[PDB]
Design a protein around this ligand. Sequence first.
Ligand SMILES: [Ca+2]
Ligand SMILES: [Ca+2]
Ligand SMILES: [Ca+2]
Ligand SMILES: [Ca+2]
Lengths: 172, 172
Amino acid sequence: NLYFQGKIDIHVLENFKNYALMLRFQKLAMTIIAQQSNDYDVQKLKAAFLHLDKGNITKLQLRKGLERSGLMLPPNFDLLLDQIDSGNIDYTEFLAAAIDRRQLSKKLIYCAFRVFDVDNDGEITTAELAHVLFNNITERDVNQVKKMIREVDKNGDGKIDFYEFSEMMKLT
Amino acid sequence: NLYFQGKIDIHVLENFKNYALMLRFQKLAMTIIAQQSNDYDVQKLKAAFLHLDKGNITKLQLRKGLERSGLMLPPNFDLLLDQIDSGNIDYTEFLAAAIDRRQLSKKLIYCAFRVFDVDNDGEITTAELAHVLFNNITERDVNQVKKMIREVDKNGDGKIDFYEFSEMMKLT
Ligand SMILES: [Ca+2]
Ligand SMILES: [Ca+2]
Ligand SMILES: [Ca+2]
Ligand SMILES: [Ca+2]
């Protein structure tokens, strides 16, 4: 009964749940990278935004932090800023956007990895990852994570090793 | 003069401009994919949100459209929704999030490509792409686009062919 089979097809919600959690995963990872980055030109910006700040500052405050660091902003800056995020900005997200992901160093990527690999055994397991993404976690929570890693779990072992995490971060 | 050289290093803004425009690029592309998708289970959701709607509806309205289509929402739906986007939602973004990008068909990807390849010669050129992303475009606009495609322009010819666009969309 094709009509019946279609009416009970749930793949749309599956895909969405996976996408949403993968997004959270990557944003958490980039928050750690942005914090640990040894690129001084990112660090000073981070420092400048923290002395204005929660994690949240107005876009006007972000522009000022940039300008006061010695940068000339392009005429369409505001339009570019809208693409990444009521006139306020998560500045760490800006900082993440300012880091070239294809050129991340192994050491910097490991700083992020280490945080998800809580027991430090070299594998981000479902329960470790669920912990990082949701930490009073439920059964349901752990299983949503287990489904989300399928795409980046290249060897099919149900865990994320460093190679897989790295691939995912360098977007390749 | 290392101190001087660092003070005039602009790479942070470069990376950000690239990231922001690449994000716009991908979101436009997914808007077209979501609109043309032959997956009926996406189409009906699209139809249900349009009869509630701008492109914008409340998250409560999104939940209702889902529920009224026959779906049971998970207990943490609201938390998952926050990851993708004052209580309102761009529902096309939801629809995009519900599509598995690794499994996009060649025909569906081409529907998006065709829109950026305005002259239909099989190449998305800088000026074509700038047109799609910004269409009274300036000189500056065209050049920001030219810098942004470097990462997905695999053969270095300054244009995006279908293979490169496809790779970019399927996130691989
Ligand atoms: Ca571990
Ligand atoms: Ca694995
Ligand atoms: Ca063309
Ligand atoms: Ca090319």
